[PDB]
Structure formats: C-alpha cells, structure tokens
Amino acid sequence: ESADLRALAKHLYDSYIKSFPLTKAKARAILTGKTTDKSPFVIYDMNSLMMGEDKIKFKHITPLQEQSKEVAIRIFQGCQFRSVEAVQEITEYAKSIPGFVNLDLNDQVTLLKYGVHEIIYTMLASLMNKDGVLISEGQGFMTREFLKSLRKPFGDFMEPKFEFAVKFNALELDDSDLAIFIAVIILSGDRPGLLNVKPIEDIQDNLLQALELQLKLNHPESSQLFAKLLQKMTDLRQIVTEHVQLLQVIKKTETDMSLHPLLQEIYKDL
Amino acid sequence: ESADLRALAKHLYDSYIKSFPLTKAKARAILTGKTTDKSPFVIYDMNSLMMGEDKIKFKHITPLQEQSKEVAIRIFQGCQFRSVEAVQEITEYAKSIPGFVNLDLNDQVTLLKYGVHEIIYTMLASLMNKDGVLISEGQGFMTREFLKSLRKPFGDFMEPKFEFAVKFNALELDDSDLAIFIAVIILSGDRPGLLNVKPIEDIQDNLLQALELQLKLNHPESSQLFAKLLQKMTDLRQIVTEHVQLLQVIKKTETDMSLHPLLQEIYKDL
Numbered sequence A, B: 001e002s003a004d005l006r007a008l009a010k011h012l013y014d015s016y017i018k019s020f021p022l023t024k025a026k027a028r029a030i031l032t033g034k035t036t037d038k039s040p041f042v043i044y045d046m047n048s049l050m051m052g053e054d055k056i057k058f059k060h061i062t063p064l065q066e067q068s069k070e071v072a073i074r075i076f077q078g079c080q081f082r083s084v085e086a087v088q089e090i091t092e093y094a095k096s097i098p099g100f101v102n103l104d105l106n107d108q109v110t111l112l113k114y115g116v117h118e119i120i121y122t123m124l125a126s127l128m129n130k131d132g133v134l135i136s137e138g139q140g141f142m143t144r145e146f147l148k149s150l151r152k153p154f155g156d157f158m159e160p161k162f163e164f165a166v167k168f169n170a171l172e173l174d175d176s177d178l179a180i181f182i183a184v185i186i187l188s189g190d191r192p193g194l195l196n197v198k199p200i201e202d203i204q205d206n207l208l209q210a211l212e213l214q215l216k217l218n219h220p221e222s223s224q225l226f227a228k229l230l231q232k233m234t235d236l237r238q239i240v241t242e243h244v245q246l247l248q249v250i251k252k253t254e255t256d257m258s259l260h261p262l263l264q265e266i267y268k269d270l
C-alpha cells in the first residue's frame, strides 16, 4: 500500500531532520547558492587557517604554526573529532528506523559499525561542491585547493571524497530522498558477523520499496533514478576501502606518544 | 511502451544464446545429477587430474608436474586460456547491444576493458555450486577443495569467486535475466576515461528499464529483486580488485610464467 510507504518516508524525513543539525537544503543555501545573510569564513591558505581558527568556533587546538604540531596533522585530527560526533547523530537516527531497535543487540552494533563510514561520506557530499567543503556547522569553508596542498600523505585524503561528491550530487537528491537512502545503507544484510539476517533484509526490502516510490514521485522526469542511486553504493564501498588504506599508511607516521592515551582512546578506528 | 522493452529483452536473450556456448540452462542440467544424458568427470585430486586428460580434452601435462610445470601452473595456464576465450565471447555479445558499435571507438574499448572481468565472474557463477565448478565446456568438474589446496598463491584465486557465486546464485536468475544484466554492466558510464558519457548513460537507462520489467514479469514474487541484483554489482568490483593484487603477486613469484597479452592489456594498476 502506497499509503504505508508514503507514511514511512515522512517518518524517516522528520526523524532525519531532528538528528542532523546541518541539512543539505541548508548547506546548499550557504554553498553555491546565494542566501547571502551570513557568509562563512573561508580557509584557502595557511594564513587563512591560522588567522581564523582562533576566530572560528573550533574545539581542539589553537592556530600555532612554527615548529609545533604540523598543520596537516591538526586538520586530519580535526576531521576525526567531527566524525566521532556524526557517529552519534547517525546512531540516534538509526533508532528511529521502524524495526531497528527490535533487532538483536549485537546485530544493531554490527550494522552501525559497518554502515557509519558509508553514511558519513554520503552526507559529507551534501556539504561539498567542486570547489570546497563546509566546516564547523557551516560557519566555515575549506577550499579543495588548500586541502590538496597539504602534506604529501594528507593531500590525497579528501580528493577521493570530492570526486565522489561531484558525481553523487549530480543526482540532485534532496533531504527527503537521502533520509530513506541512509536507512537502506544501515539495514544492509551482508555485513560480516550478523546473527539474524532475515529481519534486516525484510526491513531493507520495505525501505527500498519506500525509496523507489519517493524517487518516482519526487523526480518524475528523472528516469531510472532509483537504479542510478543504488549503483552509487559501489562507489561508496571503494571510497571506504580506499580510506582505511591511507589510514594504515598514516599509522606509519605518528605512533609512540605517551600523551595520547586517553585521547587516542576516544577515537578508536571507526 | 513496455512492448518495446520486451522486444529489447528478446533481442539480447537471442544474441546471448548465439554468443555463449555454455548457458546456465545447460550448466544446471549437467550439475543436477537428475539429468544423466552426459555427466561430468570429476577432478578432486592429483590422480583424478591425471585421469582427467584421459577422457577430457586436456592439452596440458598428465604425468609428473613438480619438475615439469607443476599442477597449479597447468591449471592456471588453462584458466588463462578460458578467460581469453571468454573475453572474445563477451566482445562478440557487446557488438549486439543496440547502440554499442555506434559509440566512439575509444569508449567501446574502455567499456570492454573495465566490464569484461565483472561479466566473467557473473557468468562463472552459472558454472558453480557450493562444491565445485564445471570445466572444459561442461565435460569436467573440478572441486572447490582441490582448488583451495593448491600452492600458497594459486589456492586463493578461486575461493572468493565461489563465495560470490553461492550468494549470487541464491537470486535464481535464468539466462534471459542475465543477458540483460550483462548488457547493463557493459554500458556503465562511470568507467575511468570515457569520452562521451551521455550516449552511454542513455543506452544503460534503456537497458535498466528492460531489466526491471524482465525481473517483474519473470519473478513476480521476488520482491526487490531488481535492487538486490544491482547491489551485487558491488561484490563484483571487489572480486576484481582482490584478483588484481593476487595477480601482481604471481608475476613476482613465477618469473618464468606469463600473463597472456590480451589480459595484460586489459589490466592496469590502481
């Protein structure tokens, strides 16, 4: 019954709105869009980052570049702090998906553990355009150039996400569409270690059904949009795999430090 | 008009039968012992192997292998042969996909280059069950266990293909379904280096519509089969990537062995 599907879609949208502060609609207004009423601080250079990190609402380290903590490192570690926040927002959203809390607890943890990275990059694209990505709740904007000019190991960290974003954003999905897509990603079914795959696939089946109707009604002229979005799931997987890769490579840069115990703890691997 | 999509489905199924000598229909009839009009000889150890060249057409070695191209080598030299053969069969099929031959020559080559191995693993599943795979046009059957017991590097080649096969086969697709799915794979558009992406996406869109109708009519009770099939496209990409690194390992261990020219061209790093 299209009734239930349309109902499911609205529910996910409302839940999505309350779990994620920065929506794509908002990010878009700020980005390429005009909506010039409070332009974001732009970070396009070392001086920009420096002469602005003290003026921006960032919570970690202050701008200090002179043989004391490399810029690239501080920026990378900065993305970790934010990803850790996103994880909690995503976890809260997952709990609103009909049926999720009723699943085996271990399976719930497994789905979140393997789905968080794919969701993070999916939503990150909402805050990106070909020229840069929004930062700090949208109060900042770090250029694509400045990021690619960072240290050798770190100058290739965001590029692949930028490439994905450009292609993903070409589908012109809106929040209402994304709310359902993100739920499909969470209720995968092929994650390793799952104990009871049936209820998970049963829910995804219902979610996919809802996603298809949402796309047909919200994008009547976009032929086969459903199929195209689903194929983007292969691009996300590669982004993630490729990501843990550069991560291990970085692991061979910073290691033994008797001052990171409690801090390194808060930031595991995911 | 669904009428035009049905005609396209028929066309592709027709060309598929004409290009691929060993269909899934024939493979299942051979595998399901219920049909013993012509059963396969089974290879599950060295002795069976020796006896294999007896009744089966094996131009390889039968006796000793250690000091004369070991078994593992003989088997993969044979595998290399079938793949090149498979590539030629797929290339022949590609030309029948409406619009393919009318594309920029450079793009035709790029589409085949990236799509060929994804198709091979899809079709290779038609020849597999949880315990082994048909060989030599169905005259033989080599055990999964036998293959996994080969020399350190050679024993890791097939296992992931079997793992893929067992799950892909759970979808219960038949030849008419696969003919359209294979065509969908070839006309990607997100392949690296494409010159004219639009004409490619226009063809894939039409093929996707054809695939969706086919699965709805041929599998009326298989909810979200279309979406489930499309997601399998992520498993294929992974298999290709692992396969490549294994290949790079062999190239360094067997400095006397050679990767066939046609396959060397298709492959590349990164």
Ligand SMILES: O=C(O)[C@H](Cc1ccccc1)Oc1ccc(Cc2ccccc2)cc1
Pocket: B073, B076, B077, B078, B079, B080, B082, B083, B120, B124, B157, B243, B247, B250, B257, B258, B259, B260, B263
């Ligand atoms: O990579 C390929 O194109 C083929 C693809 C394939 C793999 C499994 C079944 C069918 C086709 O699989 C190969 C795997 C290893 C090798 C290594 C090899 C090189 C020279 C001689 C013997 C083996 C060659 C092909």
